[PDB]
Amino acid sequence: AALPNPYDDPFYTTPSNIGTFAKGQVIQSRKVPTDIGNANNAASFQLQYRTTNTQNEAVADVATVWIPAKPASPPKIFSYQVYEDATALDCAPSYSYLTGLDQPNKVTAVLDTPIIIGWALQQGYYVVSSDHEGFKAAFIAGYEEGMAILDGIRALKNYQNLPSDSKVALEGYSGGAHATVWATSLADSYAPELNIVGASHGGTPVSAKDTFTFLNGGPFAGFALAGVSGLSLAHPDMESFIEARLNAKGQQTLKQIRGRGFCLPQVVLTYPFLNVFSLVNDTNLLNEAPIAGILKQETVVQAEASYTVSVPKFPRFIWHAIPDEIVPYQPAATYVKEQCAKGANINFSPYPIAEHLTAEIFGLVPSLWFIKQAFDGTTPKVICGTPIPAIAGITTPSADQVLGSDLANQLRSLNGKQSAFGKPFGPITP
Structure with a gap:
């Protein structure tokens, strides 16, 4: 790829003076060439920043940021979480984003990922995608992931000199949705100064x-x-x-x-x-x-938890294949049920006829549309947790209306193509 393997790169190491840095403080930055950056005329950078691990120790991590050519105002931060789904360092999102084709986890950055980040950049949003698993690549470690993501958002704010009240939205699917829900769950206690206006996740563990x-x-x-x-x-x-x-x-x-x-x-x-x-x-x-x-x-x-689980109050969009064969539906339905009972604002989209990879596409256009609405303060008023299958062109604007002709054609060409999991993607609508 454009840079050496993360194992061969001192950028992916924690410095000895890590304890001198505040949470989300930038330690180093470097300009990097990315496929998404080149495609959208946006400058991309890698930030080495201070974050916190599960054992509450100060550690470093890496995030990739994209600066739009023509940024929206007031500043809007779009935090995207990829389904890395691995426990090795060179599977890191940051390395996969780079120009090149030899990255072992390259697939996680070339399918629906460029469409989502591409779309956000075309809206003028600043985009951050953190290596949420950290330097140990601790897959599915919630506290590790959530803290890394929240500090990643802080890192971009610090790096670009963005206002303290900059609007934040979060998005992800599958392993990325686990990271996303954990970031929203820790936001109140770990990063309360962040103006999170919305979140969208699907196929959520x-x-x-x-x-x-x-x-x-x-x-x-x-x-x-x-x-x-x-x-x-x-x-x-x-x-x-x-x-x-x-x-x-x-x-x-x-x-x-x-x-x-x-x-x-x-x-x-x-x-x-x-x-x-x-x-x-x-x-x-x-x-x-x-x-x-x-x-x-x-x-x-909450029914399983040995602690009081946070109930984020900002507008949220959550989608899932009822017949999901990879990430179980019922735990996610129970979560929505529990959250709504405690006062959450959740637009819930369970698909009766879908699979893990087809629901990934079904909920994409609605997911992005919801995020724009969250940034604009125009999310629809719904009964919390009521089942509303989200369909582009029916419950939201069409793929072409939300994405534009170019990105909608890219989304349509995913139909019948192999995913990271081997299973093929389907059409935009169920």
């Missing part, structure tokens, strides 16, 4: 445990293992518990998934029909200390 039990032993069982890997990297007490119980097969498998170049496509292809419990000497692994307690912390479902 809201419970680490429920996603694990859903995926384990099936064709996408690699993500169950990746989740175990990522949580362990974020929780040292879980790491030690699992390592002591790993058999010979388990020890080599855990090393493999954390190895350089092992990213989303490798996770998909390598571990179909893997039972994660065959890697340890205990089937009751999840119900035991300290794992049971950690899983009660690594959820935004």
Whole structure:
């Protein structure tokens, strides 16, 4: 690619004086060439900034920002979260965004991603996409991800000298939706000064445990293992518990998934029909200390949580395939149900006839339209959590009206094309 592998780059290291930096303070910046940056005539930069990890230690992270040629005013920050879905450093979004084709997780940056970030830049929004997994690549570690994203937004504000009351919106799907919901959940306590006006996420993993039990032993069982890997990297007490119980097969498998170049496509292809419990000497692994307690912390479902879960009050759009075969629908429906009961403002779009990858496209145009409405202060008034399948041209403007001819044609060409997961994308409308 345009830069060396992150493993070979001192930009992806925490400096010794990291404790002198405030949360979201920029340590370093560099100009980078990106596919999206070239396509939209927007300057892209990488920011090394200070953030906080799960163990509450000061650490560095990297985010990619795009500066629109003609910015909207007042300043609007669009925070985009990718479905990285891996536990290796070079799977980082920042590296995948670069011009080049050899990045192992390149696929996460070339399908619907350029359309979304492209659209935001054409609106004049400043765009930030953080490496939400951090330098340890702790996949599905909620506190790690949420804090990294919120500091990433702070980093862009600091870098571009944007006003303290700049409007913020967040968007993501799949693994990116987990990162997004966690950022919105931690915003009140960790980053209350951020003017978050809206959020939009779909195919959302809201419970680490429920996603694990859903995926384990099936064709996408690699993500169950990746989740175990990522949580362990974020929780040292879980790491030690699992390592002591790993058999010979388990020890080599855990090393493999954390190895350089092992990213989303490798996770998909390598571990179909893997039972994660065959890697340890205990089937009751999840119900035991300290794992049971950690899983009660690594959820935004109040019924499962061992803490009081935040209820973001700003307008939100949440979509999901009811028949989702990768990220379970019911935990996400329960989350919406719980949030609405405690006073959330959620536009809920469950699709009765869809899959994980087809709902990714079905909810895209409505997602972006909702975000523009959140920025303009014109989100529709709905009964919280009432099922309204969102359809471009019916419940929102058409793909061409929202995206323009160029980006809508790019979205239409995704129909029948292989995704990161191997499954094909479908049409814009169900």
